[PDB]
Ligand binder design. Structure first.
Ligand SMILES: O=C(O)CNC(=O)C(=O)O
Ligand code: NI
Ligand SMILES: [Zn+2]
Length: 331
């Protein structure tokens, strides 16, 4: 078996290898990349997402989210307080202000230490889930707005045609902005391109050990666990690497820099934080190997998770027994 220790693998495709997206995902998996839950892909030197990022300041962040923490430094939840709309230019200025800017630090490890020590004492503001793309339409390789759709994958594999669409989202972050422990909707893949700015540090649990993280989460957030059998779907819970280590949870970490892709694999729990002002673009996708994960994916039915239109068909076709209860949670 390839990659039995479930290490995060890093790939350097040639420009020739960068033509066929599906084929390269399949290649990465042939090398065991999926066992980690997360892989890094460094694009060939000849590739570019777009010409420049000089004209992005007028993009609107309609609902910036202030991420307010509760708990202890290594075990906390965050809720999102809606703030007034601001442009990306205004957001960048805010990110760079004395109140919100990245502190002096020696290296990534030093900054990681500062993050877990001090995160809960601040409430950074995040521009998340903004529908759109920064890929040039003429970028033909690994353009996250031009991927084959999950609906077409399901149709190709299972022969049923379904409604729904599948488009990318932009994320504008600043120092300490945080993504909570989660897997993707329907335990899909995700792919994330860091367009511009400061790094993003990722933590990931191997898919074969996902239930170990779930069990610890139930212990650490007992009220939440009683309220919902799949509360990590709420995407609000954080657990530090120190606490994971103390509890023997297998995981890995890696820092993504501008110009790099990350892929998360089905049922790979991940969490992380941004080092400073940046912009990422991400989208979910599927492969034939995903179908069995989609069939088995946990669902939140307590009403908190509240997801896209397009997830309806996924649950309806892949999980017909769960469909009634789940839909009650969406309505
Ligand atoms: O970048 C973020 O804030 C969160 N991204 C993801 O969880 C992802 O790409 O799957
Ligand atoms: Ni994700
Ligand atoms: Zn729930």
């Amino acid at each position: 078996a390839q990659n039995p220790n479930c290490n995060i693998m890093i790939f350097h495709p040639t420009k020739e290898e960068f033509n066929d997206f599906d084929k390269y995902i399949a290649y990465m998996e042939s090398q065991g990349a999926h066992r980690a839950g997360l892989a890094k892909i460094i694009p060939p030197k000849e590739w570019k997402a777009r010409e420049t990022y000089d004209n992005i300041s007028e993009i609107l962040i309609a609902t910036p989210l202030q991420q307010v923490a509760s708990g202890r430094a290594g075990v906390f939840t965050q809720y999102h307080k809606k703030k007034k709309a601001m442009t990306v230019g205004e957001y960048r200025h805010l990110a760079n202000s004395k109140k919100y800017q990245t502190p002096p630090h020696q290296n990534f490890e030093d900054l990681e230490r500062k993050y877990w020590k001090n995160r809960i004492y601040n409430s950074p503001i995040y521009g998340a889930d903004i529908s759109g793309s920064l890929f040039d339409e003429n970028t033909k390789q690994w353009n996250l707005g031009h991927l084959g759709t999950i609906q077409d994958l399901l149709e190709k594999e299972c022969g049923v045609v379904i409604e729904g669409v599948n488009t990318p989202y932009l994320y504008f972050g600043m120092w300490k902005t945080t993504f909570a422990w989660h897997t993707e909707d329907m335990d899909l893949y995700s792919i994330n391109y860091l367009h511009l700015g400061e790094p993003k540090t990722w933590y990931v649990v191997p898919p074969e050990h996902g239930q170990r993280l779930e069990r610890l989460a139930r212990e650490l957030f007992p009220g939440s666990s009683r309220g919902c059998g799949a509360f990590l779907r709420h995407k609000v819970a954080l657990i530090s690497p120190t606490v994971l280590k103390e509890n023997g949870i297998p995981f890995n970490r890696i820092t993504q820099e501008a110009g790099e892709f990350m892929v998360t694999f089905p049922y790979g729990y991940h969490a992380g934080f941004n080092h400073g002002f940046n912009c990422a673009e991400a989208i979910n996708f599927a492969t034939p190997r995903w179908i069995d994960y989609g069939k088995m994916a946990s669902q939140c039915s307590c009403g908190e998770a509240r997801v896209t239109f397009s997830m309806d068909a996924f649950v309806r076709i892949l999980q017909p027994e769960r469909y009634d209860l789940w839909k009650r949670g969406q309505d």
